[PDB]
From a paper:
However, the X-ray structure of MproE166V with nirmatrelvir yielded an apo structure devoid of any nirmatrelvir density. This absence of density can be attributed to the reduced affinity of nirmatrelvir for the E166V variants. In this apo structure, we observed a significant shift in the position of the N-terminal residue S1′. The substitution of the acidic side chain of glutamate with the hydrophobic residue valine appears to be the primary reason for this reduction in binding affinity toward nirmatrelvir. In contrast, MproE166V showed a substantial shift to a monomer-dominant equilibrium with a monomer percentage of 61.3% and a dimer percentage of 38.7%, suggesting that E166 affects the initiation of enzyme dimerization and that the proportion forming MproE166V dimers is much less than that of MproWT. Of note, when MproE166V was treated with nirmatrelvir, the monomer peaks of 10+, 11+, 12+, and 13+ charge states were substantially greater than those in dimeric MproE166V-TKB272, suggesting that the binding of nirmatrelvir to MproE166V became weak. Structurally, nirmatrelvir lacks any P1′ moiety, which leaves the S1'subsite empty (left), however, TKB272 has the P1′-well-filling benzothiazole moiety (right) as well as a fluorine atom at 5-position of the benzothiazole that forms effective halogen bonds with amino acids of the active-site cavity of MproWT, playing a pivotal role in enhancing TKB272's binding affinity to MproWT. Regarding the role of E166, similar to our findings shown in Figures 2 and 6, previous studies by Duan et al focusing on the molecular mechanisms of SARS-CoV-2 resistance to nirmatrelvir and ensitrelvir show that the E166V substitution results in a loss of one hydrogen bond with nirmatrelvir.
Residue numbers in the entry:
A (entry chain A), B (entry chain A): 1 to 302
Write the structure that this text describes.
Amino acid sequence: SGFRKMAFPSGKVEGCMVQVTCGTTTLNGLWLDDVVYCPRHVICTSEDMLNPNYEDLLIRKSNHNFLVQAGNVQLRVIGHSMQNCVLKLKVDTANPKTPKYKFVRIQPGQTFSVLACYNGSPSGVYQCAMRPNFTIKGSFLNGSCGSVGFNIDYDCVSFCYMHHMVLPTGVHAGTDLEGNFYGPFVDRQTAQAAGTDTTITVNVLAWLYAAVINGDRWFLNRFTTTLNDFNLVAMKYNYEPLTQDHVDILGPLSAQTGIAVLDMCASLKELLQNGMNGRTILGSALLEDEFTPFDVVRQCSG
Amino acid sequence: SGFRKMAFPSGKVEGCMVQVTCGTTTLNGLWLDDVVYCPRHVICTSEDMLNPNYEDLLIRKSNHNFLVQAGNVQLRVIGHSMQNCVLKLKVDTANPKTPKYKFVRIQPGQTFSVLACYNGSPSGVYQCAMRPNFTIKGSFLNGSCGSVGFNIDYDCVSFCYMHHMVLPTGVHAGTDLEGNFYGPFVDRQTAQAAGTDTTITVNVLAWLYAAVINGDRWFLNRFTTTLNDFNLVAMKYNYEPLTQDHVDILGPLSAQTGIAVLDMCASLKELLQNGMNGRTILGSALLEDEFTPFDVVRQCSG
C-alpha cells in the first residue's frame, strides 16, 4: 500500500546534458539533434547580471569563448541565435543519443521531473510541481543552471522547463525551451517578487484518493458540500479555486474508490478547518499537492 | 535554499531491465554481462506461494518456460542456477548496455534508489531508506517484483536490493543481488512479522544540518546534552541509539555549520519532547530520516 513521489526514468535525458562555459561562468546545456540550448546568462559575469544588455553582450562573444563539453569530449559551434532567454548553439555534431522529444509549455499545478546537473554531469532526479505563482521549489546549487524539467510519454520526452535563476527568497524560476520565463520573472539579478503562492487543490484531492486506495481513510466523513461552498473555505486557506474541469479530471479516481468528488471535497474542508489532530495521511503530516490526478492514476495502475 | 529527496540518475540501470515470465507469472529481471537475475518465485504460481519447495519446483521447469523479453526483443537461455532466493539465467547474449557494477549488501539506515518497473519496462525512480527492521516503504504494484535498488559511485552502479515480496502489512521485503533476504523474511506467502521499526537517528540529525545550511534554524537552542542522556530520550521515542561512529560521521556537517553534533542532539531532544508546535522544517511537519549524512553532503556540495 505504498505511495512514493516518483520521478520519470532519466536515461533519455542524461545522454543530452552537456557543459557550457564562458569566462568564470559554466553551466548546463541540453544537446538535441544539432543544437545546444542553455540559459543566455551564460554570457554574463556576476557583475553583468545586475543589468545585462543581452543584445550588446551577445555581440561581443566569440564562438570560441563557449566551451561546450560532454564528459571527456569537447564540441564545436557553427551558428548561434538568441531565442528569448535561451541561447541556441548550432554544433558540429548531431547528438547520437537524441531521444524522441517535444518542447511544451506547461500550466501551473502540473508536475515534471528535473535532472539536476553540475557541469553537464547528472547528479540526481526529483519530481516537482510548477507552483501557481510559477516558481519551483528546487534543489539547485551553484551551476545547476540549465538543468531541465521533463515528462516522458511512451517513447517521447516532453521538455517543459529550464532552470535559470534562484530568487532572493531561495525559490527557483526558469523558462520553457523556447526561452520564455514561467511567471513574471526576468534573468536579471534584481529584486523580483513572486506572487502569493497557493496550494494546488486538485492535486491535494488526487492525493487523498491515493490515500483511500492505499488504505488510509480516517479522514472520510459523511458530510458533503457544493463546489461554491467548498471554494469559500478554500479561498480562506490560500487554496486554488476548484473548477468543474478539476472535478471532471478527478472522475476516474472517484470511479475507482466509490467516493464522489464533492464528498472528497467535504473531507478536505474538515481537514482545512480542523487540521489533522496529529494524525498522518500516507505517512505525511501535511497535505501534499505535488501529485496530479494523472500521476496518481499512473502510479496506482502500473 | 532548496532541499529535495533526489534519486540517482537511472539511465545506467534502465538498459539492464528485462521481463521474465513463466505461466501467468511475469516479473522484472536484471540483465548484466551474460546473466539475468530475478526473484526465484517467478517459477511459482499464486497457489505454490503458500509453501513452495523451490528445489522441486525448479526441477520441473524448462528453459523454454522462461520468456525473457527486452522491449521488443526476446532472449534465450543456456544455463540456470538458484543462488539463495535469486535465479541466475545465463543467456545467449551479453547485454551491450552493461554498466560498470558491483553487488553490495547494505546496512539498515542506508539509502538507495529504486527503479520501479512493470514488465521489464521502467516506470519511475525514487530514493528510499532500508528501515532498521529491514523493510522498504516502497511503491510496488503487481509485478514491480524484481525491481532493483542501487547507488551510483562515479562510473560504478552498486546494486544493493531486489524487491521480492509485499508483506501482509503493505511494506516491502527483498534481497541483495546474491539472493539473501534483508531481515528475517522468506519468499513464502505466509504471516511474517517485521520488527518494531525505529527512526534512523543519525539521518534525522543529518537532515537537521541540511535545514541549518538551507536557512531554517528556529529549532536551534543553547541546551546541550551527553550522548548517554540523549540516548535515554531517543530510546523512549523509538529512535535508534546514536553511537560515537554516528557522531564521527556527522563531523563534516558539524564543521560546515559551526554546530557541535551534541548540540544538534540537544535540539533534537527538545523536538522529540515538545513536538514542532505546528512549525515545519524544510517544509516538513515530521522529522525526516531518509537522508544519510553522505546524502546531505553530496546534495549540499554539488
